[PDB]
Amino acid sequence: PPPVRLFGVEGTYATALYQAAAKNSSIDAAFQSLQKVESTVKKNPKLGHLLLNPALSLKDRNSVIDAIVETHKNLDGYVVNLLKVLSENNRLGCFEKIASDFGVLNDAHNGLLKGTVTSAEPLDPKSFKRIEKALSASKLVGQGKSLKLENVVKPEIKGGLIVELGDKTVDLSISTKIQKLNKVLEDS
Amino acid sequence: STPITGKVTAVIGAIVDVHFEQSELPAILNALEIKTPQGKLVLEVAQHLGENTVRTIAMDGTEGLVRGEKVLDTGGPISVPVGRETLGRIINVIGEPIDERGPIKSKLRKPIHAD
Amino acid sequence: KAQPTEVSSILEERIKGVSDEANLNETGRVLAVGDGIARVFGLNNIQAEELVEFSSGVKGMALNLEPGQVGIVLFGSDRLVK
């Protein structure tokens, strides 16, 4: 019984890392180790990201893994061997993707159903809050699970708002309605 | 002088791939030997496939090969013996006489990749 | 507080031959050669159809600008390429 699929390409490292780690939980600890190692990649951005290049070596890649485990107890559990394999497999560059994806799987386990409330201009907090609770208590979320929510600014839309989550959306905005306004009048 | 060994990482058809070690890569068109239980077997450095991995072309019957066999560098290309000692004798591709007249002693070995 | 700076000061100096005299403005490493073509990692500020020079001294020219690498065809034998 796997979680929500990462669907093949290069999430399969993260997929195997989860489903082999999770057989004995520790995925919060493995998760925090992943957060910490992506942090120390980010905390040393010069040649933490600039040294995920493929043209180095096998040996020097393994030594960069040694520098990662050299930084205190940055790695913990399977995630070093993960890197041992990753280093050997030289898929280190697509490591950022793995991180974010494990985060998605993890907060799916928590049930944070990330949403969005697209607009062409940011809005007041009262609207945020009222919408937030709306979806939260809506059949969408079955409760027992959270509900983030992000307003974004979109100029490509002419205003209004659109709610999004669980590949399920509602647009009541302006742009689409103008469109429907032009379509209906486009007949004889 | 140390010799450079490598591992037979891939056998495809009549094309053999070798994983070498760090900065030990022979340049292109170098003869490589591997001692079979039947004899010796020759490769020629064709492609640096990257990451200390070199694709080469076989020179005899490539059957029976285990992955990861310790192939051996020869440094240079295939050099054959020359001189009037070579006259009237039957030589294979790798410079060996197969006339069963013993070896061809020769003061010069010369590579087959000149300008 | 100190040991991440130690790991950084090692790692910037661990590939100091590769990380310095570098940053691929006018430098590159021979990633893989075959058939008179070097695919070369690096060479970010390079131009299209620009002459390049090897450390062995045989010259090539770049044809395929790519995000990952640069295809360079060779004017001499590829035996001088490692």
Side-chain angles (χ1 to χ4, degrees), chain A residues 1-22 25-60 62-71 74 77-83 85 87 89-95 97 99-106 108-123 125-131 133-134 136-138 140-146 148-160 162-163 165-170 173-176 178-180 182 184 186-188, chain B, chain C:
Chain A
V4 176
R5 305 291 298 162
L6 287 175
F7 290 106
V9 177
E10 300 301 320
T12 178
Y13 282 165
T15 302
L17 181 63
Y18 181 78
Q19 71 183 357
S25 244
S26 312
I27 42 92
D28 293 331
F31 171 74
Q32 184 60 43
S33 70
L34 290 174
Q35 292 294 324
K36 189 66 181 295
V37 68
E38 184 65 30
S39 177
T40 189
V41 169
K42 190 180 289 184
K43 287 186 288 184
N44 190 4
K46 187 177 180 180
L47 293 174
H49 298 90
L50 289 172
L51 191 48
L52 297 177
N53 104 290
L56 256 187
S57 172
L58 176 62
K59 180 180 71 66
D60 299 333
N62 211 167
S63 181
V64 172
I65 302 301
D66 296 332
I68 290 167
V69 305
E70 184 206 322
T71 84
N74 235 100
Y78 295 98
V79 296
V80 52
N81 297 319
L82 213 229
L83 286 178
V85 154
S87 93
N89 270 179
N90 195 46
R91 310 199 155 288
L92 275 42
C94 312
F95 166 67
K97 151 96 68 301
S100 181
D101 268 317
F102 191 66
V104 159
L105 204 55
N106 176 215
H109 202 218
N110 299 8
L112 277 69
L113 310 198
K114 311 252 172 61
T116 307
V117 175
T118 61
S119 162
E121 87 190 356
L123 296 166
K126 181 174 75 160
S127 53
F128 279 35
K129 306 269 193 70
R130 53 204 318 290
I131 301 299
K133 320 266 269 13
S136 299
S138 80
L140 266 287
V141 186
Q143 293 314 70
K145 58 188 75 61
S146 175
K148 277 295 308 313
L149 186 148
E150 300 64 13
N151 177 332
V152 307
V153 191
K154 181 66 61 52
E156 303 200 344
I157 181 158
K158 278 173 184 160
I162 298 89
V163 175
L165 62 91
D167 64 358
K168 204 179 295 199
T169 63
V170 303
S173 77
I174 176 160
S175 59
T176 69
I178 291 177
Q179 173 94 42
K180 305 194 183 49
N182 307 140
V184 168
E186 284 156 14
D187 188 358
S188 87
Chain B
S1 178
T2 178
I4 295 170
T5 184
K7 293 183 263 74
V8 184
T9 182
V11 173
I12 298 169
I15 288 93
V16 181
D17 299 334
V18 172
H19 187 267
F20 285 107
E21 302 298 322
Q22 183 61 257
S23 296
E24 298 181 357
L25 292 174
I28 303 300
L29 306 178
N30 285 318
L32 301 176
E33 288 183 353
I34 176 65
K35 183 178 183 294
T36 73
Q38 298 177 357
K40 71 180 180 67
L41 175 57
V42 180
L43 297 173
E44 186 179 4
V45 179
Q47 295 176 358
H48 292 174
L49 292 179
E51 293 180 352
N52 292 318
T53 305
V54 172
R55 179 173 294 171
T56 60
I57 303 169
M59 292 299 169
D60 202 77
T62 181
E63 70 181 4
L65 294 178
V66 183
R67 292 185 179 94
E69 293 177 356
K70 292 182 69 65
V71 299
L72 184 61
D73 193 0
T74 68
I78 298 170
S79 293
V80 297
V82 286
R84 287 189 294 271
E85 297 292 327
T86 60
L87 293 171
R89 296 193 62 175
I90 303 168
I91 305 167
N92 60 8
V93 62
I94 60 172
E96 180 179 1
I98 60 169
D99 55 354
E100 295 177 354
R101 300 287 303 277
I104 302 173
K105 77 285 294 177
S106 293
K107 298 180 293 298
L108 294 177
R109 310 291 305 183
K110 288 183 69 65
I112 59 171
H113 292 283
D115 297 333
Chain C
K1 292 181 181 179
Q3 293 187 0
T5 64
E6 292 177 354
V7 171
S8 71
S9 65
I10 290 167
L11 189 62
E12 293 290 325
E13 295 172 353
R14 183 174 291 175
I15 57 156
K16 188 173 89 274
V18 184
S19 65
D20 293 330
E21 295 178 353
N23 295 115
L24 309 169
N25 42 6
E26 295 183 352
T27 56
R29 294 294 181 184
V30 175
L31 179 61
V33 69
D35 296 331
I37 289 173
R39 292 179 295 171
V40 167
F41 180 76
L43 291 167
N44 297 326
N45 289 318
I46 205 166
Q47 297 183 0
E49 296 178 353
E50 180 178 354
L51 295 173
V52 297
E53 184 177 1
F54 288 160
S55 178
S56 65
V58 57
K59 294 189 287 185
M61 70 175 291
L63 293 177
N64 290 328
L65 299 178
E66 291 179 355
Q69 58 186 357
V70 170
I72 292 167
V73 293
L74 304 179
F75 298 108
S77 297
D78 53 355
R79 182 170 175 83
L80 298 176
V81 182
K82 289 174 66 175

